[PDB]
Amino acid sequence: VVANYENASMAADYIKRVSNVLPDIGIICGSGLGKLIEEIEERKVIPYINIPNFPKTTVAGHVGNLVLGSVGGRKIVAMQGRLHMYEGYSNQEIALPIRVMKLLGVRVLLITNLAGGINRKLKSGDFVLIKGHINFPGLGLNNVLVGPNQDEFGPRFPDLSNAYDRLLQQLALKIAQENDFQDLVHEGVYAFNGGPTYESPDESNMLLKLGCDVVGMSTVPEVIIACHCGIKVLAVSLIANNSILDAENDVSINHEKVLAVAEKRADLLQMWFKEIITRLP
Amino acid sequence: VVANYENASMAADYIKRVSNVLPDIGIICGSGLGKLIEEIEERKVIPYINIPNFPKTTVAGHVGNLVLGSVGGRKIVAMQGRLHMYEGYSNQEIALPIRVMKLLGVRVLLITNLAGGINRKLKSGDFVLIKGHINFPGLGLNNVLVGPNQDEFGPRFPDLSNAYDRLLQQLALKIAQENDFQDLVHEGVYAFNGGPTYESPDESNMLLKLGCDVVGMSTVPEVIIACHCGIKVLAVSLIANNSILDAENDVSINHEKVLAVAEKRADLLQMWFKEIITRLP
Amino acid sequence: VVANYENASMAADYIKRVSNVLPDIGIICGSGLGKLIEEIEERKVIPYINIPNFPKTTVAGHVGNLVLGSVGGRKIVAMQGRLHMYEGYSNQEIALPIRVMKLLGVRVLLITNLAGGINRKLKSGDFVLIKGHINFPGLGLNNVLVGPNQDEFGPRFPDLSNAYDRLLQQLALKIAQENDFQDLVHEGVYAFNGGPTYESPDESNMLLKLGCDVVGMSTVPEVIIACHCGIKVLAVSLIANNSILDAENDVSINHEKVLAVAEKRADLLQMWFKEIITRLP
Ligand SMILES: Clc1ccc(C2=CSC3=NCCN23)cc1
Numbered sequence: 111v112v113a114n115y116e117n118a119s120m121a122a123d124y125i126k127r128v129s130n131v132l133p134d135i136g137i138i139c140g141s142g143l144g145k146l147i148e149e150i151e152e153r154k155v156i157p158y159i160n161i162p163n164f165p166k167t168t169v170a171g172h173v174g175n176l177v178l179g180s181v182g183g184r185k186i187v188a189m190q191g192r193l194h195m196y197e198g199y200s201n202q203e204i205a206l207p208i209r210v211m212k213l214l215g216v217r218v219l220l221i222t223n224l225a226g227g228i229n230r231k232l233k234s235g236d237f238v239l240i241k242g243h244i245n246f247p248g249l250g251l252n253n254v255l256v257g258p259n260q261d262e263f264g265p266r267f268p269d270l271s272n273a274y275d276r277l278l279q280q281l282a283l284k285i286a287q288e289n290d291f292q293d294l295v296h297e298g299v300y301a302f303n304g305g306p307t308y309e310s311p312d313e314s315n316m317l318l319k320l321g322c323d324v325v326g327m328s329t330v331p332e333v334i335i336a337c338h339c340g341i342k343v344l345a346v347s348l349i350a351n352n353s354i355l356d357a358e359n360d361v362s363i364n365h366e367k368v369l370a371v372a373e374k375r376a377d378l379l380q381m382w383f384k385e386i387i388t389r390l391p
Numbered sequence: 392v393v394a395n396y397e398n399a400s401m402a403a404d405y406i407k408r409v410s411n412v413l414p415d416i417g418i419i420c421g422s423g424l425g426k427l428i429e430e431i432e433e434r435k436v437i438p439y440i441n442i443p444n445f446p447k448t449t450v451a452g453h454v455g456n457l458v459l460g461s462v463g464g465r466k467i468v469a470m471q472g473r474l475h476m477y478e479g480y481s482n483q484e485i486a487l488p489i490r491v492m493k494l495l496g497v498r499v500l501l502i503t504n505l506a507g508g509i510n511r512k513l514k515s516g517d518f519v520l521i522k523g524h525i526n527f528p529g530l531g532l533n534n535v536l537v538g539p540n541q542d543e544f545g546p547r548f549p550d551l552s553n554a555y556d557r558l559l560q561q562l563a564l565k566i567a568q569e570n571d572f573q574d575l576v577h578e579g580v581y582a583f584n585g586g587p588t589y590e591s592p593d594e595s596n597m598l599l600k601l602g603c604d605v606v607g608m609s610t611v612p613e614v615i616i617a618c619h620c621g622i623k624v625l626a627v628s629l630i631a632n633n634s635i636l637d638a639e640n641d642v643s644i645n646h647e648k649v650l651a652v653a654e655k656r657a658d659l660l661q662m663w664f665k666e667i668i669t670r671l672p
Numbered sequence: 673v674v675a676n677y678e679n680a681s682m683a684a685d686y687i688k689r690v691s692n693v694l695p696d697i698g699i700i701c702g703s704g705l706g707k708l709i710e711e712i713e714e715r716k717v718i719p720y721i722n723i724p725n726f727p728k729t730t731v732a733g734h735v736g737n738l739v740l741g742s743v744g745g746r747k748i749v750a751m752q753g754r755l756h757m758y759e760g761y762s763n764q765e766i767a768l769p770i771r772v773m774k775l776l777g778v779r780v781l782l783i784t785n786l787a788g789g790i791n792r793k794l795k796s797g798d799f800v801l802i803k804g805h806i807n808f809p810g811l812g813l814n815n816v817l818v819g820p821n822q823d824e825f826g827p828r829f830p831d832l833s834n835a836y837d838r839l840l841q842q843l844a845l846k847i848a849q850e851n852d853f854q855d856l857v858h859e860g861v862y863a864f865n866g867g868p869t870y871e872s873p874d875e876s877n878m879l880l881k882l883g884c885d886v887v888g889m890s891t892v893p894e895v896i897i898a899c900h901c902g903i904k905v906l907a908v909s910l911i912a913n914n915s916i917l918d919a920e921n922d923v924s925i926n927h928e929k930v931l932a933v934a935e936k937r938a939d940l941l942q943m944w945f946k947e948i949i950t951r952l953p
């Protein structure tokens with residue numbers, strides 16, 4: 111199924127019939143970072159399998175729901191169960207849920223992910239406000255927009271220079287300062303590694319030479335689809351490890367260590383994003 | 392349809408029956424840079440849709456013609472309507488028209504494109520004679536030659552060290568000096584960004600570190616297919632903007648600004664390439 | 673056909689019925705470097721076309737056999753006729769023979785390849801023990817593991833930091849010292865160029881900046897599939913040329929020069945790997 115105007119419209123019509131919520135804000139949460147979705151007020155849960163034209167996610171399994179409701183007095187829509195390109199999903203499958211958000215009225219998209227640290231200042235448990243990216247799949251002819259352009263949504267050749275909104279970054283930092291955890295918050299450039307193997311030690315050393323601060327396997331495809339159709343983005347990485355220190359010391363990484371860092375920071379991240387939602391313009 | 396010897400032969404046979412021209416020179420022109428095609432003498436226009444085994448271009452639409460005729464007393468064939476890989480065309484679709492040129496007798500291919508400047512010496516409106524390239528799709532398993540080798544056309548493992556002919560570069564520069572616009576002409580290395588998003592600010596900074604002078608979304612696939620089958624190439628970029636200055640100043644880019652630069656330089660480029668065609672060995 | 677547990681099991685069952693060999697060691701040899709396979713004792717030759725679920729290799733042609741038998745008193749299985757991703761084989765086709773090795777009992781995989789030298793210390797005819805890699809296809813969403821994870825074989829997110837076993841590297845070096853050819857043996861980082869074009873002169877200069885020692889078009893996909901399922905790896909490059917010197921001097925390369933270097937070093941490499949097999953733990 112193509113992520114075109116007709117197919118996105120059919121999905122949006124179903125959601126409006128079931129939900130009664132017109133959301134202004136969309137959220138996509140990283141693994142182990144989804145507690146906020148469970149606290150959405152007056153919520154409505156819509157399994158992806160119920161929605162016309164949503165991608166099929168049964169080969170990978172696990173949860174897959176849209177959740178609509180209220181947080182801090184604002185109307186929101188969340189993806190619970192994220193689609194990643196290393197799983198084999200196509201460009202069209204990644205893009206269709208974001209374009210449905212657009213048709214439902216979303217103007218701001220908030221995103222979190224787990225990432226490896228490249229900048230020497232970064233420690234396990236730190237946060238990075240993403241200010242730009244290096245898209246290795248895009249340079250190499252696997253951009254999420256390869257294919258015919260869907261002109262109803264945006265232009266053939268988008269400019270990404272303002273993909274990461276400056277004022278949203280400033281608001282996130284302001285809340286951290288108000289609550290005395292600004293020492294955990296950095297800004298940086300995110301490198302997209304298609305995955306699913308972690309960056310090798312010598313790949314990490316290369317990324318340090320090229321001016322990357324963090325590296326991960328998500329986020330950039332959704333940012334590009336949002337920017338193409340005029341949705342503002344805030345994206346925050348939680349640092350699982352420093353890959354440069356690990357390379358210099360011959361130390362390993364695994365999904366278990368990543369998820370333990372996620373559990374340590376989950377409650378703070380939930381509170382931070384609730385406050386951002388409450389206050390964003 | 393595969394870009395093999397039998398399929399290219401059927402297309403070439405049709406063209407020879409309709410056209411009566413055996414061309415020595417092929418041209419592919421960048422967007423807004425096609426005026427020369429409209430001045431071809433004794434011309435014959437052959438829509439792609441009429442030619443056996445030519446790729447289907449109706450999803451993207453717009454013009455798609457082969458034009459044969461004379462320029463400066465030389466016999467030429469032009470592609471009017473270029474195929475780009477960010478549109479979703481396959482390796483085989485890009486390659487078949489160049490291999491048909493080979494079977495028609497083409498020995499030299501002249502190419503223009505619009506590009507972003509990375510080298511700090513480059514200004515909007517400058518020209519760059521391409522002397523080499525950095526092929527990010529090729530390094531990343533999306534080379535135009537991935538697939539079975541078509542042995543009738545060239546070798547399994549081509550060498551690209553002489554893909555950009557030195558004497559053709561010298562002749563282009565000589566004509567610029569004769570007519571007092573050599574101050575606009577540079578030489579440089581072209582980075583292939585698969586696209587269709589413009590290079591991000593942080594991607595531009597990376598390309599500066601890696602020794603690239605210009606960046607764009609075309610040209611390298613056609614150069615590789617031509618080199619594989621023994622066709623000499625001259626490739627010239629028109630600089631739409633300096634992406635490094637734009638990153639340092641927080642300034643944006645769009646297809647409209649690009650096309651305005653193309654209109655400013657269109658007549659000079661037409662005259663330059665007419666003179667190159669007249670004089671090349 | 674997917675490289676899953678059921679499909680690999682059917683292939684392994686056929687091989688055990690025909691062969692009577694349970695191998696501990698697997699080998700994959702570079703082009704012109706396969707003499708050792710011809711010296712396997714008490715050997716059994718099984719064409720790929722005879723084995724359930726093995727990939728179809730008739731479009732490319734040439735040899736394609738599994739060979740089982742004894743070398744130096746150890747039980748081995750060799751791939752005679754290597755599958756390369758520049759030929760158009762999919763992720764699943766590359767992976768299935770390595771996963772069949774796993775099910776047959778292989779614990780160690782030995783690999784050779786032909787490569788271009790980037791480090792200035794490297795000369796034609798030198799050997800490089802690979803200690804790490806830079807996987808441009810992997811960074812760019814063409815990793816061999818893109819797709820559903822086959823959980824019976826390994827984890828969703830593998831760590832590659834110990835993909836190249838340290839003790840196997842030490843043993844290879846020890847044998848070279850015992851026989852007075854250690855002056856030919858280096859260690860280094862391997863860059864994977866998807867191919868099939870040789871690295872361009874300006875790509876070679878980029879790889880020098882990024883800390884690569886050698887560049888080639890194979891090996892990394894098989895290393896990743898082996899590491900994912902717990903097989904230890906030794907990988908050795910034979911240097912055909914120095915691509916940096918060739919770029920500075922305007923000198924070319926071709927498959928013929930590569931194969932002449934292979935013929936010069938073939939007998940030494942056969943003797944070296946026979947001794948490694950005899951002595952590895
Ligand atoms: Cl991350 C964060 C965000 C907000 C607070 C806070 C201090 S007072 C108060 N009334 C409701 C929220 N709130 C603390 C931490």
Ligand SMILES: Clc1ccc(C2=CSC3=NCCN23)cc1
Pocket residue numbers: 566570659662663664666
């Ligand atoms: Cl780009 C260019 C190329 C040629 C000329 C020129 C000066 S005299 C003359 N007779 C015909 C062409 N021609 C000027 C500019």
Ligand SMILES: Clc1ccc(C2=CSC3=NCCN23)cc1
Pocket residue numbers: 847851940943944945947
């Ligand atoms: Cl590459 C290599 C490997 C081994 C030797 C060697 C010296 S004595 C001896 N008995 C059998 C093998 N062998 C020489 C060269």
